[PDB]
Amino acid sequence: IQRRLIKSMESVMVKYDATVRNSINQVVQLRYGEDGLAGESVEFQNLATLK
Amino acid sequence: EDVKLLQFHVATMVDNELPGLPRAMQKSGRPLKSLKQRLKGKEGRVRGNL
Amino acid sequence: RHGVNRQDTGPLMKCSFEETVDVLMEAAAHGESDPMKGVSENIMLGQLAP
DNA sequence: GAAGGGCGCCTATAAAAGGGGGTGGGGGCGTTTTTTTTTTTTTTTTTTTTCGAACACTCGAGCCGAGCAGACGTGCCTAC
DNA sequence: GTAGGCACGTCTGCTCGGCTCGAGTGTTCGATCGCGACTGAGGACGAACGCGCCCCCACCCCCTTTTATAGGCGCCCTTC
């Protein structure tokens, strides 16, 4: 299951205008992860206004 | 018959696992390793060496 | 296997995954052109991957 | 009968010449058939988690078009 | 000049042929984690095979007899 999965997604990558596109240069997302943030720099937070 | 035999030998040269067809063998009885088999699996050129 | 091959990616990528000879035979027969734009084709070819 | 003894043929060498015979060397036919009804067996049939679709193919089926035939309508001939 | 009746034309529906549809059956593909790391399988590798035996041909050999020379031995016959 892991080998098959990597084999699909391998060529997707964030380009220098920050839209995420695969090998034939089709757009996957307009911004990576819909906000353009990094996954190792995020944290869990509480939203005050749902009070 | 010669054409049928030639057609078989050149086919078995390229691909030796043809469905419904006998397979090429040796005195050992081992199936021949044709070019498709060499490419095909985990131990094949595409994945194993390349 | 039967879905990834419907993608409009270059033929050499599709060979690197389970289809081996068969996708190359069809690629040769249609005469498609592989633009070496993706990660696998470039690593197999040996030039610095993008 | 069993056993030991005596007589005689055996193989080698030679060397020739005519003719029958053998093991080939190579090509042929690829049979068809005689049956023995066969080693081609059931591998494991599965012990299953089996597909996993995709694609080709099967077979049937229903809508639709043209032609045909009768009913309805029109066109043509005869009699007062 | 005019009206009624027989044949032909018009219209609609039934039958046949033509065109496209799927549940079903078939094929047929495929992969089955990573790595190891050991030997040692090192004797093979028994299968080689006739495939099926067939005829034509080519070439070499066996086939008698001579005589001397000698072990090896098969057979007959008398004695045990």
UniProtKB/Swiss-Prot annotation, chain C:
The gene it comes from is POLR2A
| Task of the protein | Catalytic core component of RNA polymerase II (Pol II), a DNA-dependent RNA polymerase which synthesizes mRNA precursors and many functional non-coding RNAs using the four ribonucleoside triphosphates as substrates. Pol II-mediated transcription cycle proceeds through transcription initiation, transcription elongation and transcription termination stages. RNA-dependent RNA polymerase that catalyzes the extension of a non-coding RNA (ncRNA) at the 3'-end using the four ribonucleoside triphosphates as substrates. An internal ncRNA sequence near the 3'-end serves as a template in a single-round Pol II-mediated RNA polymerization reaction. May decrease the stability of ncRNAs that repress Pol II-mediated gene transcription.
- Describe the family membership recorded for this protein in Swiss-Prot or TrEMBL: Belongs to the RNA polymerase beta' chain family.
Where is this chain's protein located in or outside the cell? Nucleus; Cytoplasm; Chromosome
Which species does the entry assign this protein to?
Answer: Homo sapiens (Human)
The domain section of the record reads: The C-terminal domain (CTD) serves as a platform for assembly of factors that regulate transcription initiation, elongation, termination and mRNA processing. The trigger loop allows entry of NTPs into the active site, switching between an open and closed state with each NTP addition cycle.
Where does this protein hold DNA template strand?
Answer: R1
Q: Give the protein name, as stated in the record.
A: DNA-directed RNA polymerase II subunit RPB1
Q: Which residues bind DNA nontemplate strand?
A: R6
Question: Which top-rank group of organisms is this from?
Answer: Eukaryota
Modifications the protein undergoes after translation, according to the UniProt entry:
The tandem heptapeptide repeats in the C-terminal domain (CTD) can be highly phosphorylated. The phosphorylation activates Pol II. Phosphorylation occurs mainly at residues 'Ser-2' and 'Ser-5' of the heptapeptide repeat and is mediated, at least, by CDK7 and CDK9. POLR2A associated with DNA is specifically phosphorylated at 'Ser-5' of the CTD by CDK7, promoting transcription initiation by triggering dissociation from DNA. Phosphorylated at 'Ser-2', Ser-5' and 'Ser-7' of the CTD by CDK9 (P-TEFb complex), promoting transcription elongation.
Description of how the protein assembles with itself and partners: Component of the RNA polymerase II (Pol II) core complex consisting of 12 subunits: a ten-subunit catalytic core composed of POLR2A/RPB1, POLR2B/RPB2, POLR2C/RPB3, POLR2I/RPB9, POLR2J/RPB11, POLR2E/RPABC1, POLR2F/RPABC2, POLR2H/RPABC3, POLR2K/RPABC4 and POLR2L/RPABC5 and a mobile stalk composed of two subunits POLR2D/RPB4 and POLR2G/RPB7, protruding from the core and functioning primarily in transcription initiation. Part of Pol II(G) complex, in which Pol II core associates with an additional subunit POLR2M; unlike conventional Pol II, Pol II(G) functions as a transcriptional repressor.
Q: Which disease is it linked to?
A: Neurodevelopmental disorder with hypotonia and variable intellectual and behavioral abnormalities: An autosomal dominant neurodevelopmental disorder characterized by profound infantile-onset hypotonia, developmental delay with poor speech, delayed walking, and impaired intellectual development. Additional variable features include feeding difficulties, dysmorphic features, and visual defects.
